[PDB]
Structures are given as structure tokens and as C-alpha cells.
Design an enzyme around this catalytic site. Sequence first.
Site, PDB file in Angstrom:
ATOM      1  N   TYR A  54       0.806  -1.216   0.000  1.00 59.87           N
ATOM      2  CA  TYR A  54       0.000   0.000   0.000  1.00 59.87           C
ATOM      3  C   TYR A  54       0.841   1.269   0.000  1.00 59.87           C
ATOM      4  O   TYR A  54       0.277   2.367   0.015  1.00 59.87           O
ATOM      5  CB  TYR A  54      -0.979  -0.011   1.181  1.00 59.87           C
ATOM      6  CG  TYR A  54      -1.873  -1.238   1.168  1.00 59.87           C
ATOM      7  CD1 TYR A  54      -2.678  -1.520   0.065  1.00 59.87           C
ATOM      8  CD2 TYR A  54      -1.893  -2.135   2.244  1.00 59.87           C
ATOM      9  CE1 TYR A  54      -3.481  -2.656   0.027  1.00 59.87           C
ATOM     10  CE2 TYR A  54      -2.700  -3.284   2.218  1.00 59.87           C
ATOM     11  CZ  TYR A  54      -3.488  -3.530   1.108  1.00 59.87           C
ATOM     12  OH  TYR A  54      -4.276  -4.650   1.064  1.00 59.87           O
ATOM     13  N   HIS A 111       2.785 -11.249   3.048  1.00 54.04           N
ATOM     14  CA  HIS A 111       1.472 -10.613   3.165  1.00 54.04           C
ATOM     15  C   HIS A 111       0.344 -11.564   2.783  1.00 54.04           C
ATOM     16  O   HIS A 111      -0.696 -11.590   3.446  1.00 54.04           O
ATOM     17  CB  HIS A 111       1.413  -9.350   2.318  1.00 54.04           C
ATOM     18  CG  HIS A 111       0.368  -8.374   2.759  1.00 54.04           C
ATOM     19  ND1 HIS A 111       0.365  -7.060   2.349  1.00 54.04           N
ATOM     20  CD2 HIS A 111      -0.708  -8.519   3.576  1.00 54.04           C
ATOM     21  CE1 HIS A 111      -0.665  -6.437   2.901  1.00 54.04           C
ATOM     22  NE2 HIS A 111      -1.334  -7.300   3.644  1.00 54.04           N
TER      23      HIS A 111
END
Length: 289
Positions: A54, A111
Site C-alpha cells: 500500500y 502478506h
Amino acid sequence: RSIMSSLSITLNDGSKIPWLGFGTGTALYTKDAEQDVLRAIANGIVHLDGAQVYGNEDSLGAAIAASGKPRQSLYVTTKLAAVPAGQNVRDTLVTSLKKLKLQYVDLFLIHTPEQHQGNLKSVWKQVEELQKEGLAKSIGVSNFRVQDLEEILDGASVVPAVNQIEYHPYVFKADQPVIEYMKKKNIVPTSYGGLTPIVRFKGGPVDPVLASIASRVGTTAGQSVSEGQVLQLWLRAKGIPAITTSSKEERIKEYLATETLPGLTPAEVQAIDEAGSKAHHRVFSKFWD
């Protein structure tokens, strides 16, 4: 406040992870991300959760530097995204560390297994080597199902210290197998999305249960307690660190309070388990379903 001065959970490698964390999450603007981290640090949260994907690692590092708090007081997590073409895992971590302005992260997670299909064992071995190299103090995974954990554990020298997953009462029933598996392997779950029942599904079956318990905890503590705080106490009772996302100082102050509010009783945790089990609401990582 520091890691030492805070409620923490012991990992399978001996290190302590603070029970209460704050994540920049999917914050759209890095300018907001930096201010929210500063607010989290200023109000006493000492566990900061970032991610490559992000793009908020620069904000997280700038906020740490601007907070005036010693880096050694703080626990910093970041998360491996996809490996860019022509690079390896180490390359992404060196890039993360430069953005964070750190010499090492406390915790480095894969992740999601969806970004490494067919290469899970290879990626995990690379993450194991990063811990040997001194770049990641502890190593773990995120959004790993039982099968994903089975894959990387086959021939592993390090068992992941944590599996960061969506965890709240509306995924409690579905997640029972992976929770049982992790407790056998001494993998600590950490929760994101802990407030999902009341932020995204207000009016489901958990709400009156949370209201009843909040009244109880509040009378024991001598202060008003919210349904959101009970959702965190539910995580605290299970020994699951809570990663939060609220920007607002008033909510951040509420999160802090849950570190030391009176704990839930067995009947209270059970009641939340049961009420949560009446509905499945998985918001993230839908491939789990």
C-alpha cells in the site's frame, strides 16, 4: 510507553510483540498515514504495522522519526508484497528498510500466499535467511490457511512466529481449524479487522452480547466501556494481538484503555463466540472461502 512498558505476547522465538498495534492499513494518502501514525505513537501505541503493497512505509518511517520516540521503544512490522521482476525477497526488504529508515524490522511477514503461488517454500526459505542476516528480528506470515502453513512448514528451519489474519466474532466459526492448527505449532495469530462486526455489520447477533458485556466490564472498571472495546477484550482474552486502524484520538484513547480494562470472563468470551458463530462475515482475503 514502550514495548517493555506495554502488555505484550510472547512469540515462539522468545521476543515480545505488543498486544495493541496500529496499522496504516489501506490509507489512501501518505500525508494522512503519517499524521495517523504520529497520533497513534503520541497516545501510547507502541506496535506499528506497515506493508509494502500500500506504499505507506515512507509515512510510517517519517512518523517514527518525527514522533521523537526512540525507535527501540517501538515494534515495527512490515509485509512482503509481490516480488518485483528481477528481484528477490531480500531486495524488497532492503527497499522497505530504506523507506522506514530502519536497520531492521521487528517482524517481517509474507502478506498473502496468493502472491507467491508455486513459490511458497522458496519465499519462506528466503525470509528465514533474512532473519539470519539480521534484517528481520522475527518472521511470520499473513492470511495463511492451514494448507499454506503446511506447505511452508514442510522442510522449514523456522516456524512462523505469527499468522496475521482477519479475526473477529464473525469469522470465529470458520477459522476454528486454522486457530487449532496454529496453537499446536505455537504460531501466534494476530488480528486485523477486529471491529468488523460493529463497523460493517451493525445489527447482527453479536451486538446485544457486546452491549451486555460492555456494561459489565464498565461497572467493574468504573468507567464507560464501548462495544468496540469489548471486541478488543475478546481478542485480549484469547491472547491475540489486536491491530487497529482508527485515526481519531478519542478512539485511539479507547483502544489504549483496553490494554488494562478488566478482562472478559469465560462465559463472556463463550457468549461472543456463540453469537459470532451465528453469522459468517469475511471481509478480506475472500480466497479463504
